[PDB]
Design a protein around this ligand. Structure first.
Ligand code: CL
Ligand code: CL
Ligand code: CL
Ligand code: CL
Ligand code: CL
Ligand code: CL
Length: 333
């Protein structure tokens, strides 16, 4: 056989099910001689596939413009990204701009972070530039290109809060607001992802940053409250034993990472601004509320790491001003 088969590797919800349900993915393919990709990439353009739309139809992955493996000893190098962008010149669908059809070498992506619909529309940009899909022939893997997508952004999986002591029965803490303070020259809102070495760099000639406080209050999983007259839309974070989540189970933030896999250089390069109420019972229908707003919380160094899931656990110290942070990290797989 000579037709090119597609497969997407499934990890032990999966990335694959998301691609199957949504827009699928896009493929770049560069045909070289037997000499290979590293020898010839410098003067090779995506001459075989340029943003080829790969979609799932019932039980298999397919593409419309059919292509065949070479009859001779020529090789094909593949790259892939997701979610697919149907307007790659402007980034209508995903705010993804691709390197041109006549650009030489490994491709690039210019990506902008989607802040619309209260952060609920952010794209989980995945790419594939692993060597096992480079220098492929019909004999490489039974004529099938197996893609393995990696998360190239940073995930803020959750922000959890708890007091440092048990508040007893007559006092509760409610979180009502949260902002991210990105500094002025730290967090990119627009950046270039390079498939050559799987790294992010600034846009040219001038870097594009988040330089103002970003309000996350409507992103938070706030619910109605009716506690001793207190009825502000909030999250009860009173449990001292287990920190209470501010994001819902299905919601997370996906940002262009800071310093790629290294994260922030210093503690407080990135900060949080939190609002919370300490409610003490007076009667069943009345209370005393202590409202703290715009309280600064510095995030630790080596945070917002590429390919990492970060969960921040905030401990509100009841005998002081202080809010201390734990950056719990996981590999984003
Ligand atoms: Cl936006
Ligand atoms: Cl800064
Ligand atoms: Cl501001
Ligand atoms: Cl509710
Ligand atoms: Cl609770
Ligand atoms: Cl530090």
């Amino acid at each position: 056989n000579r037709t090119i088969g597609l497969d997407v590797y499934t990890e032990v919800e999966t990335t694959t099910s998301t691609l199957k349900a949504n827009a699928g993915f896009g493929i770049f393919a560069y045909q070289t001689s037997s000499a290979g990709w590293n020898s010839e990439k410098g003067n090779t353009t995506p001459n075989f596939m340029y943003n080829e739309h790969a979609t799932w139809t019932s039980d298999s992955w397919g593409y419309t413009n059919l292509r065949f493996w070479p009859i001779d000893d020529k090789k094909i190098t593949f790259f892939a990204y997701a979610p697919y962008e149907s307007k790659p010149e402007v980034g209508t669908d995903q705010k993804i701009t691709l390197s041109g059809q006549n650009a030489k070498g490994a491709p690039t992506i210019t990506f902008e972070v989607k802040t619309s619909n209260n952060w609920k529309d952010m794209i989980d940009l995945v790419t594939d530039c692993h060597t096992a899909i480079q220098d492929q022939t019909n004999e490489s893997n039974k004529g099938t290109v197996q893609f393995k997508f990696s998360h190239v952004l940073t995930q803020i999986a959750n922000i959890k809060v708890k007091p440092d002591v048990n508040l007893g029965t007559d006092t509760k803490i409610f979180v009502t607001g949260l902002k991210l303070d990105p500094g002025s020259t730290t967090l990119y809102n627009k950046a270039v992802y390079k498939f050559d070495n799987d790294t992010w760099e600034a846009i040219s000639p001038d870097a594009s940053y988040f330089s103002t406080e970003q309000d996350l209050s409507d992103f938070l999983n706030k619910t109605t409250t009716d506690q001793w007259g207190y009825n502000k839309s909030s999250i009860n974070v009173s449990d001292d034993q287990n920190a209470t989540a501010l994001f819902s189970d299905t919601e997370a933030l996906y940002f262009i990472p800071v310093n790629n896999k290294n994260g922030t250089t210093n503690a407080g390069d990135l900060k949080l601004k939190i609002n919370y109420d300490i409610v003490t019972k007076v009667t069943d229908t009345s209370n005393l509320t202590s409202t703290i707003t715009n309280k600064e919380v510095s995030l630790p160094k080596n945070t917002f790491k590429k390919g990492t899931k970060h969960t921040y656990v905030l401990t509100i110290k009841m005998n002081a001003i202080k809010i201390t942070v734990e950056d719990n990290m996981e590999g984003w797989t």
